[PDB]
């Protein structure tokens, strides 16, 4: 019993996006379907729900006349259309099946994997990776600074995955420029700076950018 949603979207402000949800492993017309969104770092917002049998929809008043839900019985699929897009609409959108005990909202049972939607003026760009250089000359810290890439995500590994015990990878930050930057760091003993040669692997698939870069003092 599974809900498979469509892939991540990147859109300019004022545009429109259609997100799809396909149901597997249970009969589609038996349960209402909610749409819920979560902006990063924030909580859950209910957009509305649809009855895939009747085609009935209830949209939360805030989104009425902007957001639309439809369905296709043929392909056991639900649609969400968000129009007149704004920065406020950046986040992950989930479809979730209600248990619909008693033909009523009861609780959200099966969830989709979610669909990331990003809304910005910005254009696809690979990151600039900068060394964060070790000093003195006890214990020290090394890293990468992965700057000004769009859109999310990127991947960052140290010693090409060889040591995961010391690594702290910080979430990126949406800059006033409109592009993302994050930092990656590791802690090591400070006699090791002359000896070991430090790997840095960064993958930004949206720009299809793969980057390896090394940090010494």
């Amino acid at each position: 019993e599974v809900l498979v949603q469509s892939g991540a979207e990147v859109k300019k402000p004022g545009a429109s996006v259609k997100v799809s949800c396909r149901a597997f492993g249970y009969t589609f017309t038996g349960n209402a379907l909610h749409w819920v969104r979560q902006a990063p770092g924030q909580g859950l917002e209910w957009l509305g729900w649809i009855n895939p049998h009747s085609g009935d929809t209830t949209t939360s008043q805030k989104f009425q006349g902007r957001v639309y839900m439809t369905r296709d019985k043929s392909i056991n699929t639900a649609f969400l259309d968000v129009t007149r897009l704004t920065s406020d609409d950046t986040g992950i959108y989930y479809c979730a099946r209600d248990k619909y005990y008693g033909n009523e909202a009861v609780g959200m049972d099966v969830w989709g994997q979610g669909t990331s939607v990003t809304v910005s003026s910005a254009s696809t760009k690979g990151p600039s990776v900068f060394p964060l250089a070790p000093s003195s000359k006890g214990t020290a810290a090394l890293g990468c600074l992965v700057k000004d890439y769009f859109p999310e995500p990127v991947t960052v590994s140290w010693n090409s995955g060889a040591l995961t015990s010391g690594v702290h990878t910080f979430p990126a930050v949406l800059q006033s420029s409109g592009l993302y930057s994050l930092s990656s760091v590791v802690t090591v003993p400070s006699s090791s700076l002359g000896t070991q040669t430090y790997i840095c692997n960064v993958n930004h698939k949206p720009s299809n950018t793969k980057v390896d870069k090394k940090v010494e003092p």
Binding site: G43, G107, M108, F130, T139, A141, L145, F170
Partner: protein, 203 residues
């Protein structure tokens, strides 16, 4: 029709009995649900009809509610259980989710290890410079980084599954206008695990 979830952040240890609250500003007629969400994943249903457990949920979870007051109780917290918890009401439209309650693993106070990294030469060759302050492995998570003698942005890690601590990366960024204040740049770090503020610098 507002749902207030309390508290917003809770600190607890394995084996702790723990209770979480949801107040509705008006009566819901037991049409109320509780969700658990681990970071990166989607929520799971825990409770419906505000006291009834979903199939597959451990007995250590319990809930009750009367009128405008609803509670979720874990009889003994298990490591699996540190996550964020949401309430949702079905009473009428819109169906609303509570703000959330994050439940974090409580540990002993630990002071951060502070580091400062000046911009790269390579970064300098791009016409832009960023100075970074790294706070490694502290607790609790409330801490203060100050840059000045400018506008900066901070980013925090998750709680370490191994050590149960936090880390912070602050980035002070000036390309625009070698700051109208240009001598010594520094970051003062305030945390309650430290005697008094720790400072790091160069140039």
């Amino acid at each position: 029709i507002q749902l207030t979830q309390s508290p917003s952040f809770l600190s607890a240890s394995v084996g702790d009995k723990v209770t979480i609250t949801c107040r509705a500003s008006q009566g819901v007629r037991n049409e109320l649900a509780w969700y658990q969400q681990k970071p990166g994943k989607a929520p799971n249903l825990l409770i419906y009809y505000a006291s009834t457990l979903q199939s597959g949920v451990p007995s250590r979870f319990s809930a009750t509610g009367s009128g405008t007051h609803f509670t979720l109780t874990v009889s003994s917290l298990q490591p699996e259980d540190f996550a964020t918890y949401f309430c949702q009401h079905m009473s009428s439209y819109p169906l609303t989710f509570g703000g959330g309650t994050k439940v974090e693993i409580k540990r002993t106070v630990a002071a951060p290890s502070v580091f400062i990294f000046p911009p790269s030469d390579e970064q300098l060759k791009s016409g832009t410079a960023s100075v970074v302050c790294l706070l490694n492995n502290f607790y609790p998570r409330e801490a203060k980084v100050q840059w000045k003698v400018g506008n900066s942005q901070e980013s925090v890690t998750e709680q370490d599954s191994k050590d149960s601590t936090y880390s912070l990366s602050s980035t002070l960024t000036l390309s625009k206008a070698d700051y109208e204040k240009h001598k010594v740049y520094a970051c003062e770090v305030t945390h309650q695990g430290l005697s008094s503020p720790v400072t790091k610098s160069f140039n």
